[PDB]
């Protein structure tokens, strides 16, 4: 008979199902998964700079609570904050906590610059058994607890720090809250006390809270922490008739702030990756991931789907 030539295409025994606009189950010869659904059980310490807070969350790091000394001088792209972090110092709150946490994290460094504050006649360096350092009663190492003199004097304090440097300064300060009027007067003769902090374009007044409170770390007393950013050319004025927890200097702010924080228990390993989730680092080239919406660095985009297969071959029709 006459010769015959047939044109055709390849096939395999069993291909991969993909979706199209029309059909939702079409078999093709090859396909590639586009959703990353696997993570590493560790965080990669390179190429991004990670700082592990360990026992100390970022706020206690800034205040200088006991156990947070490894964080002095630290610089990070991503601060790794541990869910099992523990308080080690005086019972405290921060009225706009998340905002201060954001600022510290985003700034990306703990660079403290000590200054001499010439407090008048009041005694300095008050300590507590709720804040033991090396088994000895102590305090936040960035703060200076002021109380009245031995001759029962807590006069109006009034000092100024002038920013003539080339960087914005972050001052963290506090206000102590006794449990009774007697305690108030016993610590700072005046009642009420009061803290007033001002800059060129802002001024704040805090009136101390006095009331019985649950025992935290053995105490009913509290400190509330505040902060003031002082731009170059501006300055800060501290005023007190009592209850001030004074700063021992300021933290330096980077002009450009591009770091962040990641709260996770995942251990830091020895792998290489620029994408970190709260479940661990991703090591992938896929455009999407379904592991966590919490993702930092150079990451695939988070989606709800567990799988999306991209066809990389023709329809598979075996036999």
């Amino acid at each position: 008979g006459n010769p015959v030539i047939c044109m055709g295409h390849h096939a395999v025994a069993n291909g991969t199902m993909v979706k199209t606009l029309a059909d939702d189950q079409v078999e093709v010869v090859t396909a590639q998964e586009l959703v990353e659904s696997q993570n590493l059980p560790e965080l990669c310490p390179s190429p991004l700079r990670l700082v592990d807070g360990q026992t100390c969350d970022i706020i206690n790091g800034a205040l200088g609570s006991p156990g947070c000394d490894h964080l002095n001088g630290a610089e990070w792209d991503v601060f790794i904050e541990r869910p099992n972090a523990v308080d080690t110092c005086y019972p405290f709150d921060v009225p706009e906590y998340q905002s201060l946490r954001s600022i510290l994290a985003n700034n990306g460094k703990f660079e403290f610059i000590a200054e001499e504050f010439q407090w008048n006649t009041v005694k300095q360096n008050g300590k507590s058994g709720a804040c033991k350092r090396a088994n000895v009663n102590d305090f936040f190492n960035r703060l200076n607890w002021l109380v009245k003199s031995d001759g029962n004097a807590y006069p109006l304090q009034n000092l100024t720090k002038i920013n003539n440097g080339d960087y914005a300064r972050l001052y963290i300060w506090g206000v102590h809250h006794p449990s009774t009027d007697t305690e108030q007067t016993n610590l700072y003769k005046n009642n009420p006390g009061g803290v007033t902090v001002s800059t060129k374009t802002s001024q704040t007044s805090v009136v101390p809270n006095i009331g019985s409170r649950p025992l935290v770390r053995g105490l009913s007393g509290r400190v509330s922490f505040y902060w003031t950013i002082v731009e170059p050319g501006d300055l800060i004025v501290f005023n007190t008739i009592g209850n001030l927890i004074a700063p021992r200097g300021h933290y330096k702010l980077n002009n450009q702030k591009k770091s962040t924080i990641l709260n996770t228990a995942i251990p830091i390993g020895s792998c290489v990756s620029k994408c970190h989730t709260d479940k661990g680092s991703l090591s992938t080239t896929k455009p999407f991931q379904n592991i966590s919406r919490i993702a930092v660095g150079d990451c695939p985009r988070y989606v709800k789907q567990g799988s999306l297969k991209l066809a990389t071959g023709m329809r598979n029709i075996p036999e």
């Binding site: 047939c6 044109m7 055709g8 295409h9 023709m314 029709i317 075996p318 036999e319």
Partner: peptide, 20 residues
């Protein structure tokens, strides 16, 4: 084209012939 060719392993498309 009714089906593909599992024996075509070194390309995606091809020729199959029969002559004398």
């Amino acid at each position: 084209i009714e089906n593909g060719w599992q024996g075509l392993i070194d390309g995606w498309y091809g020729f199959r012939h029969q002559n004398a």
